[PDB]
Short mmCIF file of C-alpha atoms in Angstrom, two decimals:
data_model
loop_
_atom_site.label_atom_id
_atom_site.label_comp_id
_atom_site.label_asym_id
_atom_site.label_seq_id
_atom_site.Cartn_x
_atom_site.Cartn_y
_atom_site.Cartn_z
CA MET A 257 -0.11 0.24 -0.09
CA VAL A 258 3.02 2.35 0.87
CA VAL A 259 5.08 1.82 -2.50
CA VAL A 260 2.15 2.58 -4.58
CA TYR A 261 1.08 5.67 -2.38
CA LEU A 262 4.68 6.88 -3.06
CA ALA A 263 4.84 6.74 -6.64
CA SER A 264 1.96 8.37 -7.03
CA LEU A 265 2.72 11.52 -4.64
CA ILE A 266 5.29 12.26 -7.32
CA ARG A 267 3.24 11.61 -10.29
CA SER A 268 0.42 13.65 -9.26
CA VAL A 269 1.56 17.38 -10.19
CA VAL A 270 2.42 15.78 -13.66
CA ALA A 271 -0.64 13.86 -14.16
CA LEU A 272 -3.28 16.25 -13.14
CA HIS A 273 -2.16 19.34 -15.16
CA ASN A 274 -1.37 17.43 -18.39
CA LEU A 275 -5.06 16.10 -18.37
CA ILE A 276 -6.84 19.58 -19.55
CA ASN A 277 -3.84 19.77 -22.67
CA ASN A 278 -5.06 16.10 -23.71
CA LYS A 279 -8.48 16.26 -23.18
CA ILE A 280 -9.05 19.39 -25.80
CA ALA A 281 -6.91 17.58 -28.22
CA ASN A 282 -9.16 14.37 -27.98
CA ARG A 283 -12.08 15.42 -28.87
CA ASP A 284 -10.73 17.10 -31.91
CA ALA A 285 -8.54 14.14 -32.71
CA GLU A 286 -11.95 11.84 -32.72
CA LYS A 287 -13.44 13.80 -35.48
CA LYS A 288 -10.93 12.57 -38.03
CA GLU B 818 -12.83 -7.06 -56.96
CA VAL B 819 -12.34 -10.55 -57.78
CA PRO B 820 -9.31 -11.90 -57.34
CA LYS B 821 -8.23 -14.02 -60.31
CA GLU B 822 -7.91 -10.53 -62.80
CA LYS B 823 -5.43 -9.07 -60.40
CA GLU B 824 -2.81 -12.20 -60.73
CA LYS B 825 -2.23 -11.34 -64.09
CA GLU B 826 -1.86 -7.81 -63.98
CA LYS B 827 0.44 -7.59 -61.01
CA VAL B 828 2.86 -10.04 -62.54
CA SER B 829 3.51 -7.45 -65.61
CA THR B 830 3.71 -3.96 -63.83
CA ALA B 831 6.49 -5.68 -61.47
CA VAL B 832 8.85 -7.39 -63.69
CA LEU B 833 9.21 -4.27 -65.14
CA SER B 834 9.31 -2.35 -62.14
CA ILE B 835 12.19 -4.19 -60.75
CA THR B 836 14.24 -4.06 -64.22
CA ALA B 837 14.26 -0.44 -64.29
CA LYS B 838 16.13 -0.27 -61.44
CA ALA B 839 18.45 -2.18 -62.71
CA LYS B 840 19.30 0.08 -65.54
CA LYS B 841 20.00 3.11 -62.76
CA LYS B 842 23.38 1.75 -61.15
CA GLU B 843 24.95 1.36 -64.55
CA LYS B 844 26.45 4.56 -65.83
CA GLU B 845 29.48 4.54 -68.34
CA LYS B 846 27.85 7.68 -70.29
CA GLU B 847 29.00 10.50 -67.67
CA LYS B 848 31.56 10.90 -70.43
CA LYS B 849 30.31 11.63 -73.79
CA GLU B 850 29.76 14.44 -76.12
CA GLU B 851 27.50 12.68 -78.74
CA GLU B 852 25.45 14.32 -81.63
CA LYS B 853 26.24 12.02 -84.38
CA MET B 854 22.99 9.80 -83.52
CA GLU B 855 22.48 6.20 -82.97
CA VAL B 856 21.73 6.58 -78.80
CA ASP B 857 20.63 9.79 -77.61
CA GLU B 858 19.97 7.90 -74.13
CA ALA B 859 20.40 8.68 -70.84
CA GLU B 860 21.04 5.27 -70.10
CA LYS B 861 18.95 5.07 -66.63
CA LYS B 862 15.64 4.72 -66.36
CA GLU B 863 13.91 5.29 -63.42
CA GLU B 864 10.39 5.50 -61.70
CA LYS B 865 8.18 7.20 -58.43
CA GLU B 866 4.91 8.21 -57.34
CA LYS B 867 3.54 10.83 -54.87
CA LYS B 868 -0.21 10.69 -53.82
CA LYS B 869 -2.59 12.93 -52.11
CA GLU B 870 -3.97 12.04 -48.50
CA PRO B 871 -7.33 13.82 -47.97
CA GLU B 872 -10.91 12.89 -48.89
CA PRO B 873 -13.44 15.24 -47.21
CA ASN B 874 -15.14 14.78 -43.54
CA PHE B 875 -14.28 10.93 -43.81
CA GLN B 876 -16.50 9.88 -40.73
CA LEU B 877 -17.72 12.80 -38.53
CA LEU B 878 -16.40 11.40 -35.32
CA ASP B 879 -15.02 8.05 -34.44
CA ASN B 880 -18.04 6.15 -35.26
CA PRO B 881 -19.90 6.35 -38.97
CA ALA B 882 -20.08 9.44 -41.31
CA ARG B 883 -24.18 10.00 -40.14
CA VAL B 884 -25.50 13.47 -40.60
CA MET B 885 -22.94 15.44 -42.62
CA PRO B 886 -23.00 19.31 -43.76
CA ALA B 887 -24.14 20.13 -47.05
CA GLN B 888 -27.75 19.07 -48.01
CA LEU B 889 -29.30 17.07 -50.96
CA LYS B 890 -32.77 16.16 -52.34
CA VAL B 891 -32.80 12.32 -53.37
CA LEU B 892 -35.74 11.23 -55.14
CA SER B 893 -37.68 8.13 -54.40
CA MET B 894 -36.90 5.09 -55.96
CA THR B 895 -33.23 5.55 -55.57
CA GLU B 896 -31.26 2.65 -53.76
CA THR B 897 -28.10 3.54 -55.68
CA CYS B 898 -28.42 6.63 -53.79
CA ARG B 899 -30.91 4.64 -51.16
CA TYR B 900 -31.68 5.35 -47.62
CA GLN B 901 -30.00 3.88 -44.58
CA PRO B 902 -29.99 3.21 -40.72
CA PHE B 903 -28.07 6.07 -40.53
CA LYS B 904 -30.56 8.32 -42.35
CA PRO B 905 -33.55 8.78 -40.03
CA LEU B 906 -31.20 11.37 -37.91
CA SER B 907 -30.61 13.26 -41.44
CA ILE B 908 -34.74 13.65 -42.45
CA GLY B 909 -36.25 16.67 -41.69
CA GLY B 910 -33.00 18.93 -42.75
CA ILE B 911 -35.36 22.06 -43.11
CA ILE B 912 -37.18 20.92 -46.06
CA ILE B 913 -38.72 23.34 -48.74
CA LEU B 914 -42.14 23.90 -50.36
CA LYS B 915 -40.44 22.52 -53.63
CA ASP B 916 -41.03 19.20 -51.63
CA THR B 917 -44.46 17.88 -52.49
CA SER B 918 -44.23 15.16 -50.47
CA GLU B 919 -42.88 16.39 -47.18
CA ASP B 920 -43.11 15.67 -43.44
CA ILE B 921 -46.11 16.41 -41.62
CA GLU B 922 -46.06 14.03 -38.68
CA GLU B 923 -42.58 12.76 -36.89
CA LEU B 924 -40.12 10.03 -38.31
CA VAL B 925 -40.62 6.63 -39.49
CA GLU B 926 -37.25 6.22 -37.44
CA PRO B 927 -35.88 2.85 -39.86
CA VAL B 928 -37.85 2.97 -43.27
CA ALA B 929 -41.45 2.71 -44.52
CA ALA B 930 -43.50 5.16 -46.33
CA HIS B 931 -43.82 8.34 -45.00
CA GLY B 932 -46.14 11.21 -44.56
CA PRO B 933 -46.43 12.97 -47.94
CA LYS B 934 -47.90 16.66 -47.52
CA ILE B 935 -51.14 17.87 -48.80
CA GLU B 936 -50.84 17.81 -52.64
CA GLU B 937 -52.34 20.56 -54.68
CA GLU B 938 -49.64 19.32 -57.79
CA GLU B 939 -48.41 15.83 -59.34
CA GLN B 940 -45.79 17.69 -61.11
CA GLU B 941 -42.65 16.46 -58.83
CA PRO B 942 -44.61 12.99 -58.09
CA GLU B 943 -43.97 10.42 -61.08
CA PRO B 944 -46.54 8.24 -62.60
CA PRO B 945 -47.08 4.17 -61.73
CA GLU B 946 -44.18 2.24 -62.63
CA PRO B 947 -44.37 -1.61 -61.37
CA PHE B 948 -41.71 -4.63 -63.10
CA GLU B 949 -44.34 -6.91 -61.58
CA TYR B 950 -46.17 -7.93 -64.65
CA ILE B 951 -43.33 -8.07 -67.17
CA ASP B 952 -40.97 -10.64 -64.87
CA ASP B 953 -42.72 -13.45 -66.26
CA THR C 56 46.97 2.62 -62.87
CA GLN C 57 44.69 4.85 -64.99
CA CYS C 58 44.57 2.94 -68.12
CA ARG C 59 43.29 -0.49 -66.14
CA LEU C 60 40.42 1.78 -63.79
CA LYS C 61 37.95 2.48 -66.60
CA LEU C 62 37.49 -1.56 -67.00
CA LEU C 63 37.89 -2.40 -63.66
CA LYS C 64 34.65 0.09 -62.68
CA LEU C 65 32.78 -1.35 -65.72
CA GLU C 66 33.40 -4.99 -64.54
CA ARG C 67 31.90 -4.40 -61.25
CA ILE C 68 29.10 -2.39 -62.29
CA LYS C 69 28.34 -5.45 -65.06
CA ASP C 70 28.13 -8.00 -62.26
CA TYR C 71 25.75 -5.69 -60.10
CA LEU C 72 23.10 -5.80 -62.74
CA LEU C 73 23.79 -9.45 -62.92
CA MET C 74 22.60 -10.19 -58.99
CA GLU C 75 19.59 -7.44 -59.19
CA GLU C 76 18.35 -9.31 -62.44
CA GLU C 77 17.91 -12.59 -60.34
CA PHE C 78 15.76 -11.03 -57.74
CA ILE C 79 12.97 -10.18 -60.65
CA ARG C 80 13.43 -13.67 -62.10
CA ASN C 81 12.65 -15.70 -58.66
CA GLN C 82 10.20 -13.10 -57.45
CA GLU C 83 7.79 -12.20 -60.15
CA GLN C 84 8.74 -13.28 -63.73
CA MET C 85 7.19 -16.79 -64.46
CA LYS C 86 6.63 -18.40 -67.77
CA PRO C 87 6.88 -22.63 -67.48
CA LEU C 88 6.95 -22.72 -63.92
CA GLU C 89 3.92 -20.77 -62.85
CA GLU C 90 1.72 -21.20 -59.58
CA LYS C 91 2.04 -25.11 -61.40
CA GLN C 92 5.22 -25.87 -60.34
CA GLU C 93 4.69 -24.64 -56.64
CA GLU C 94 1.82 -27.28 -56.58
CA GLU C 95 3.98 -29.79 -58.11
CA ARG C 96 6.39 -29.47 -54.94
CA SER C 97 3.49 -29.84 -52.46
CA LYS C 98 2.28 -32.75 -54.00
CA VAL C 99 5.55 -34.53 -54.39
CA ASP C 100 6.38 -33.28 -50.84
CA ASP C 101 3.17 -34.88 -48.87
CA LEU C 102 3.60 -38.23 -51.04
CA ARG C 103 7.04 -38.24 -50.61
CA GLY C 104 6.82 -37.88 -46.97
CA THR C 105 8.59 -35.60 -44.89
CA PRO C 106 10.47 -36.37 -42.55
CA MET C 107 12.95 -38.09 -45.45
CA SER C 108 15.09 -40.52 -44.03
CA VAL C 109 18.76 -40.42 -45.45
CA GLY C 110 20.07 -43.37 -47.53
CA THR C 111 23.12 -43.33 -49.46
CA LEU C 112 22.58 -45.26 -52.89
CA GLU C 113 25.24 -47.81 -53.38
CA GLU C 114 24.34 -49.61 -56.61
CA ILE C 115 20.97 -49.85 -58.37
CA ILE C 116 19.26 -53.06 -59.72
CA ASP C 117 16.82 -52.70 -62.58
CA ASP C 118 13.64 -54.48 -61.74
CA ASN C 119 12.64 -51.99 -59.52
CA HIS C 120 15.02 -52.49 -56.54
CA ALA C 121 17.96 -50.65 -55.32
CA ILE C 122 20.18 -51.66 -52.34
CA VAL C 123 20.56 -48.72 -49.87
CA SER C 124 22.11 -48.37 -46.69
CA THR C 125 20.23 -46.39 -44.07
CA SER C 126 22.35 -43.73 -42.49
CA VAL C 127 20.53 -43.79 -39.04
CA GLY C 128 22.77 -47.26 -38.21
CA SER C 129 20.66 -50.69 -39.53
CA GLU C 130 20.67 -50.78 -43.60
CA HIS C 131 17.58 -51.57 -45.78
CA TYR C 132 16.91 -53.38 -48.87
CA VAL C 133 14.91 -50.91 -50.41
CA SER C 134 12.43 -50.52 -53.75
CA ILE C 135 13.33 -47.88 -56.63
CA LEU C 136 9.71 -46.60 -56.84
CA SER C 137 8.71 -42.95 -56.84
CA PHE C 138 9.94 -40.33 -58.19
CA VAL C 139 13.12 -41.23 -59.63
CA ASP C 140 14.38 -43.72 -62.29
CA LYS C 141 17.19 -46.14 -62.06
CA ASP C 142 19.37 -44.04 -64.38
CA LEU C 143 18.27 -41.09 -62.42
CA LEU C 144 20.11 -42.41 -59.26
CA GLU C 145 23.96 -42.28 -59.29
CA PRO C 146 26.36 -44.37 -57.12
CA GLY C 147 27.57 -42.86 -54.06
CA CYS C 148 25.20 -40.10 -53.19
CA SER C 149 22.61 -39.22 -50.91
CA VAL C 150 18.97 -40.16 -51.20
CA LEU C 151 15.50 -39.77 -49.84
CA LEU C 152 13.43 -42.98 -48.68
CA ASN C 153 10.14 -41.97 -47.39
CA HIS C 154 9.89 -42.46 -43.64
CA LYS C 155 6.94 -44.86 -43.02
CA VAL C 156 8.08 -47.29 -45.65
CA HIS C 157 11.74 -47.37 -46.99
CA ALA C 158 11.15 -47.00 -50.92
CA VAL C 159 13.96 -44.61 -52.75
CA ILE C 160 12.35 -41.58 -53.75
CA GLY C 161 15.09 -40.21 -55.43
CA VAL C 162 18.46 -38.49 -55.79
CA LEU C 163 18.62 -34.83 -55.31
CA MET C 164 22.09 -34.31 -53.19
CA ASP C 165 25.22 -35.92 -53.30
CA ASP C 166 27.48 -36.85 -50.83
CA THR C 167 31.12 -35.77 -50.24
CA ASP C 168 33.43 -37.51 -47.83
CA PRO C 169 34.77 -37.08 -44.47
CA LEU C 170 37.86 -37.56 -45.59
CA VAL C 171 38.31 -35.02 -48.68
CA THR C 172 36.80 -31.95 -47.00
CA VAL C 173 40.06 -31.70 -44.41
CA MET C 174 42.53 -32.70 -47.27
CA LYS C 175 41.38 -30.21 -49.48
CA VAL C 176 43.15 -27.27 -50.32
CA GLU C 177 41.79 -24.71 -52.93
CA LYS C 178 44.30 -24.33 -56.03
CA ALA C 179 46.04 -21.17 -56.82
CA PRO C 180 49.43 -19.84 -56.16
CA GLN C 181 50.32 -16.70 -54.25
CA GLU C 182 53.26 -15.99 -56.31
CA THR C 183 52.04 -15.70 -59.92
CA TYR C 184 53.21 -17.61 -62.71
CA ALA C 185 56.59 -16.33 -64.59
CA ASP C 186 57.20 -14.50 -61.21
CA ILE C 187 58.53 -18.34 -59.85
CA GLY C 188 61.33 -17.62 -62.23
CA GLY C 189 64.44 -18.41 -61.20
CA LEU C 190 65.29 -21.67 -62.26
CA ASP C 191 63.07 -20.62 -64.90
CA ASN C 192 64.17 -23.91 -66.88
CA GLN C 193 62.61 -26.67 -64.12
CA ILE C 194 59.36 -24.56 -63.69
CA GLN C 195 58.50 -25.48 -67.37
CA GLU C 196 59.22 -29.27 -67.04
CA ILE C 197 56.53 -29.79 -64.29
CA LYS C 198 53.75 -27.98 -66.58
CA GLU C 199 54.88 -30.31 -69.21
CA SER C 200 54.95 -33.46 -66.79
CA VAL C 201 51.68 -33.36 -64.62
CA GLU C 202 49.97 -30.72 -66.44
CA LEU C 203 50.32 -31.31 -70.52
CA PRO C 204 49.09 -35.29 -70.58
CA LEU C 205 45.71 -34.02 -69.15
CA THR C 206 45.69 -30.58 -71.15
CA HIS C 207 47.14 -31.61 -74.44
CA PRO C 208 46.42 -35.51 -75.42
CA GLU C 209 48.07 -34.70 -78.76
CA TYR C 210 51.40 -35.34 -78.11
CA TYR C 211 50.96 -38.63 -76.04
CA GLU C 212 48.82 -40.31 -78.75
CA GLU C 213 51.32 -39.60 -81.39
CA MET C 214 54.06 -40.84 -78.84
CA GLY C 215 52.07 -43.61 -78.12
CA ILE C 216 52.29 -45.81 -75.19
CA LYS C 217 51.82 -45.48 -71.20
CA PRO C 218 51.72 -41.49 -70.11
CA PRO C 219 53.50 -39.75 -66.85
CA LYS C 220 52.19 -40.71 -63.38
CA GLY C 221 54.13 -38.12 -61.34
CA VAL C 222 57.03 -36.04 -60.76
CA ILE C 223 59.11 -35.63 -57.69
CA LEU C 224 60.16 -32.20 -56.66
CA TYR C 225 63.71 -32.43 -54.56
CA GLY C 226 66.59 -30.10 -53.71
CA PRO C 227 66.62 -27.58 -50.96
CA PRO C 228 63.59 -25.36 -49.70
CA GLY C 229 62.63 -22.19 -51.32
CA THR C 230 62.89 -22.80 -54.83
CA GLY C 231 58.89 -22.98 -54.77
CA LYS C 232 58.20 -26.83 -54.92
CA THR C 233 54.51 -26.24 -53.05
CA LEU C 234 53.95 -22.69 -55.69
CA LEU C 235 54.79 -25.24 -58.88
CA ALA C 236 52.24 -28.07 -57.49
CA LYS C 237 49.73 -25.17 -56.84
CA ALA C 238 49.93 -24.05 -60.83
CA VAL C 239 49.31 -26.97 -62.70
CA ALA C 240 46.68 -27.62 -60.44
CA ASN C 241 45.14 -24.72 -60.56
CA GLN C 242 45.49 -24.40 -64.85
CA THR C 243 43.81 -27.81 -65.13
CA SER C 244 41.45 -27.38 -62.57
CA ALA C 245 42.33 -31.22 -61.46
CA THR C 246 41.09 -31.59 -57.58
CA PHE C 247 43.91 -30.58 -55.58
CA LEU C 248 43.86 -32.99 -52.54
CA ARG C 249 47.06 -32.19 -50.10
CA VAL C 250 48.63 -33.78 -47.28
CA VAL C 251 51.65 -33.20 -45.44
CA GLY C 252 53.66 -36.46 -44.91
CA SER C 253 53.43 -36.34 -41.28
CA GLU C 254 49.67 -37.78 -41.39
CA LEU C 255 51.38 -40.70 -42.47
CA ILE C 256 53.19 -41.69 -39.15
CA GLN C 257 50.47 -40.46 -36.38
CA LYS C 258 50.36 -42.40 -32.79
CA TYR C 259 47.43 -45.03 -33.90
CA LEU C 260 49.38 -47.72 -36.20
CA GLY C 261 48.42 -48.30 -40.14
CA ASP C 262 46.96 -45.05 -40.54
CA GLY C 263 49.74 -44.11 -43.08
CA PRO C 264 48.99 -47.08 -45.47
CA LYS C 265 45.32 -46.36 -44.99
CA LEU C 266 45.11 -42.52 -45.74
CA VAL C 267 47.76 -42.73 -48.67
CA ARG C 268 45.22 -45.61 -50.46
CA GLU C 269 41.84 -43.80 -49.41
CA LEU C 270 43.32 -40.49 -50.97
CA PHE C 271 44.33 -41.93 -53.97
CA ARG C 272 41.32 -43.96 -54.68
CA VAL C 273 39.33 -40.63 -53.87
CA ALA C 274 41.55 -38.88 -56.02
CA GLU C 275 40.71 -41.85 -58.97
CA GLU C 276 36.76 -41.10 -58.32
CA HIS C 277 37.04 -37.41 -58.45
CA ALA C 278 39.55 -37.77 -61.30
CA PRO C 279 41.30 -36.24 -63.61
CA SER C 280 43.37 -35.18 -60.39
CA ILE C 281 46.84 -33.82 -58.33
CA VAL C 282 47.66 -35.49 -55.22
CA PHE C 283 50.27 -33.83 -53.69
CA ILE C 284 52.14 -35.42 -50.87
CA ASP C 285 53.86 -32.50 -48.66
CA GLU C 286 57.27 -33.20 -47.60
CA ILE C 287 57.58 -36.82 -47.10
CA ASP C 288 60.98 -36.61 -44.56
CA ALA C 289 59.17 -37.48 -41.54
CA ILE C 290 58.58 -41.30 -41.78
CA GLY C 291 61.89 -42.00 -40.11
CA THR C 292 62.01 -38.41 -38.58
CA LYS C 293 59.33 -38.72 -36.29
CA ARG C 294 58.18 -41.52 -33.88
CA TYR C 295 55.45 -40.99 -31.00
CA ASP C 296 56.50 -44.46 -29.80
CA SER C 297 58.63 -47.87 -30.89
CA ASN C 298 56.35 -48.92 -33.11
CA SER C 299 55.75 -45.83 -34.88
CA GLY C 300 59.50 -45.12 -35.50
CA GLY C 301 61.45 -48.02 -37.15
CA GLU C 302 60.91 -50.29 -39.86
CA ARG C 303 57.48 -51.46 -39.59
CA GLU C 304 55.96 -47.88 -40.13
CA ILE C 305 58.53 -46.78 -42.78
CA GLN C 306 57.88 -49.87 -45.21
CA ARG C 307 54.20 -50.15 -44.95
CA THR C 308 54.07 -46.45 -45.91
CA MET C 309 57.13 -47.23 -48.79
CA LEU C 310 55.20 -50.51 -49.64
CA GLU C 311 51.82 -48.75 -50.53
CA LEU C 312 53.13 -46.30 -52.01
CA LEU C 313 54.60 -48.80 -54.77
CA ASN C 314 51.31 -50.96 -55.38
CA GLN C 315 49.18 -47.73 -55.54
CA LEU C 316 51.10 -45.60 -58.24
CA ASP C 317 51.99 -48.27 -61.25
CA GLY C 318 51.27 -51.33 -59.91
CA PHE C 319 47.92 -54.01 -59.54
CA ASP C 320 45.69 -51.72 -58.78
CA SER C 321 47.14 -48.89 -60.61
CA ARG C 322 46.04 -45.24 -61.36
CA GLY C 323 44.49 -43.31 -63.93
CA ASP C 324 46.37 -40.61 -65.33
CA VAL C 325 45.77 -39.17 -61.76
CA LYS C 326 49.09 -37.59 -61.23
CA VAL C 327 50.92 -37.59 -57.78
CA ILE C 328 53.40 -34.79 -57.06
CA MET C 329 55.83 -35.33 -54.45
CA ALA C 330 57.59 -32.87 -52.37
CA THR C 331 60.38 -33.99 -50.38
CA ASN C 332 63.43 -31.86 -48.94
CA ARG C 333 65.61 -35.09 -48.46
CA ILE C 334 65.60 -38.19 -50.93
CA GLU C 335 67.85 -39.68 -48.09
CA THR C 336 64.74 -40.37 -46.65
CA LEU C 337 62.94 -41.61 -49.49
CA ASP C 338 64.11 -45.21 -51.32
CA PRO C 339 65.54 -46.39 -54.86
CA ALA C 340 62.16 -47.66 -55.45
CA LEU C 341 60.07 -44.10 -55.34
CA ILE C 342 62.75 -42.19 -56.96
CA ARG C 343 62.57 -45.13 -59.91
CA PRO C 344 60.73 -44.07 -62.96
CA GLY C 345 57.46 -44.83 -64.29
CA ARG C 346 55.85 -44.40 -60.92
CA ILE C 347 57.48 -40.79 -60.86
CA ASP C 348 58.72 -40.22 -64.41
CA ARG C 349 60.88 -36.95 -65.15
CA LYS C 350 62.43 -36.36 -61.53
CA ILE C 351 62.96 -32.66 -60.87
CA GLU C 352 66.02 -31.87 -59.31
CA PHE C 353 66.64 -28.06 -58.27
CA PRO C 354 70.32 -27.08 -57.45
CA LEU C 355 71.69 -24.34 -55.03
CA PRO C 356 70.99 -20.92 -56.73
CA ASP C 357 73.46 -19.90 -59.13
CA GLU C 358 75.11 -16.37 -58.95
CA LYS C 359 72.88 -15.13 -61.75
CA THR C 360 70.00 -17.48 -60.58
CA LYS C 361 70.59 -15.73 -57.07
CA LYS C 362 69.13 -12.34 -58.40
CA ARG C 363 65.71 -13.84 -59.96
CA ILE C 364 65.58 -15.82 -57.15
CA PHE C 365 65.70 -12.70 -54.48
CA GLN C 366 63.15 -10.68 -57.09
CA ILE C 367 60.32 -13.31 -56.26
CA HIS C 368 60.34 -12.11 -52.23
CA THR C 369 60.87 -8.77 -53.10
CA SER C 370 57.78 -8.78 -55.28
CA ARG C 371 55.68 -10.45 -52.23
CA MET C 372 56.90 -7.51 -50.11
CA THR C 373 57.14 -4.03 -51.58
CA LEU C 374 58.95 -3.91 -54.81
CA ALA C 375 62.85 -3.12 -54.67
CA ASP C 376 64.58 -0.66 -56.96
CA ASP C 377 67.05 0.61 -54.50
CA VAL C 378 68.36 -2.80 -53.56
CA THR C 379 71.82 -3.70 -54.76
CA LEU C 380 71.62 -7.39 -55.85
CA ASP C 381 75.64 -7.85 -56.25
CA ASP C 382 76.08 -7.56 -52.46
CA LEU C 383 73.77 -9.93 -51.76
CA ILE C 384 75.56 -12.56 -54.56
CA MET C 385 79.22 -11.76 -53.38
CA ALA C 386 78.34 -11.98 -49.68
CA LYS C 387 76.96 -15.60 -50.12
CA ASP C 388 76.52 -17.91 -52.56
CA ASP C 389 75.13 -21.65 -53.36
CA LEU C 390 73.15 -21.56 -50.30
CA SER C 391 69.34 -22.12 -50.67
CA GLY C 392 66.17 -20.78 -51.13
CA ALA C 393 65.49 -20.92 -47.70
CA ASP C 394 68.81 -18.09 -47.07
CA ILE C 395 67.42 -16.01 -49.60
CA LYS C 396 64.07 -16.08 -47.36
CA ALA C 397 66.23 -15.58 -43.99
CA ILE C 398 67.93 -12.12 -45.96
CA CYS C 399 63.97 -10.73 -46.74
CA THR C 400 62.66 -11.50 -43.06
CA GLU C 401 65.47 -10.08 -40.98
CA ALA C 402 65.06 -6.56 -42.91
CA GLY C 403 61.72 -7.06 -42.27
CA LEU C 404 62.15 -7.37 -38.21
CA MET C 405 64.60 -4.51 -37.80
CA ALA C 406 61.84 -2.14 -39.37
CA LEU C 407 59.15 -3.61 -37.43
CA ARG C 408 61.39 -2.76 -34.19
CA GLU C 409 61.55 1.01 -34.98
CA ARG C 410 58.10 0.80 -36.59
CA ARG C 411 59.52 1.40 -39.73
CA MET C 412 56.60 -0.14 -41.79
CA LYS C 413 59.00 -0.21 -45.13
CA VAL C 414 62.01 -2.16 -45.97
CA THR C 415 64.39 -0.11 -48.27
CA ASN C 416 67.82 -0.90 -48.94
CA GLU C 417 69.36 0.20 -45.70
CA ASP C 418 67.32 -2.32 -44.00
CA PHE C 419 68.36 -5.24 -46.14
CA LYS C 420 72.15 -4.26 -45.87
CA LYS C 421 72.21 -3.75 -42.02
CA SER C 422 70.43 -7.39 -41.46
CA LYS C 423 72.50 -8.96 -44.27
CA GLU C 424 75.94 -9.21 -42.33
CA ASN C 425 74.32 -10.73 -39.29
CA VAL C 426 72.23 -13.23 -41.57
CA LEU C 427 75.31 -14.71 -43.36
CA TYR C 428 77.40 -15.23 -40.06
CA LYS C 429 73.94 -16.66 -38.43
CA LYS C 430 73.38 -19.28 -41.36
CA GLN C 431 76.96 -21.10 -40.08
CA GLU C 432 75.83 -20.49 -36.23
CA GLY C 433 72.73 -22.46 -37.29
CA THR C 434 74.37 -25.75 -37.18
CA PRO C 435 76.07 -25.95 -34.00
CA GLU C 436 79.31 -23.75 -33.02
CA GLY C 437 79.93 -25.55 -29.75
CA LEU C 438 81.99 -23.50 -26.70
CA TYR C 439 84.30 -22.37 -29.88
CA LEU C 440 84.78 -25.04 -32.67
#
């Protein structure tokens, strides 16, 4: 339980900010 | 497509393509000053192609084409410009008074005869034409 | 240099066109082959039965049988049926048998001996002809004796009677006895089998008469041929034991040679070429003619010959036009081919120490005084003798 949670804590900032840029990209990408 | 006709055809084009490529490596005629006539070749043969990717609004979304921009009238008795299970959605489409058979009630959803508007004319409709009695 | 180059460039390019043209034939281009041969293969493989168990075809019986020895370990008396004819099978070859029930399906493949693979070395001399000059008279003789009765039948047929059956190349090393055997063999393109004499005396006993008869017999099958027996001095010189030295070992090997060459068993127009550095070890019966025919003797190089012998060594290295040949003839003379090789090596050796990576006159001169002394020293000087 500890091991996963530590990996999660470093990843979090990266993963959560990026989401908004990828989200927008996806909707447009889907059409073609 | 039918497989058999392609197989004859493929062999022909291909054998040439590889032979042309053989001629390209082979150069002697870098040095020359010919006008006396007999050759007047480059003595290399090559080939290439380029093609363009596009084709307009292939599929609306990832799923099939369905509704798309630009509008058409399609006459009845067409199935080589058919109605589809992808076209219930399409029907309506701000229909004109030039269609004398236009909506008056809902949709039929997948196919059936649909409401024809109260007719004052028969210019747009076409006279009877069964193939029933000429079959035998 | 420039004169050669246009043709060289063109030859490599002609060969490129040849490679590339093969690819188009196997992949696309067909006319007799088609889809049809593909199916012929499938149909034949399934009837034939994969795996095919190897056999060797010793002989064919015309009634629809053949005598096969299966290579697994136990032999079978098969029928010749299925995709082959009696004549289509060939003796001393590897054949395909149907795995389920052995009938001989056929010969696609040939069988090479285990012996021949080791013995054999490729034909071509590293010193080109007319640059093994120096005893130039002698070089010609071998071309006449071994090469010619095979190359040109005209003289022999008019001359009549038995042709030659060998040559013996003898005398001090360095007069190029190996280079000569390889030349004639190259020219004819007769399978060149090569064995050192020391293989004739090894630890196991009777290996000598055994190897030599098998070697010859294999030469007759793969005929026309040249057998080279390199440096037969070892017979007496060597021993791994008492039985491996001594009279029994020496005799058996000599005795085998006598029967093999002209005797009852004979040989065809297959030639044996012998290199020996001592005919002291060799008998008067293998120096006897008509199983040796012309013998070639090389004497010590003469003063004039020595300059031509020196040129050959110089050609393998870098070509001299600054070596004084007179100094070499003056310092030593009536010393072997091996002495001219000794002057050359020592020059190369001093240059190596500096990391000079050429030889020049200077390297030859500096090394030359020590080498002459050294020749005498090679044989014992003791304490002060």
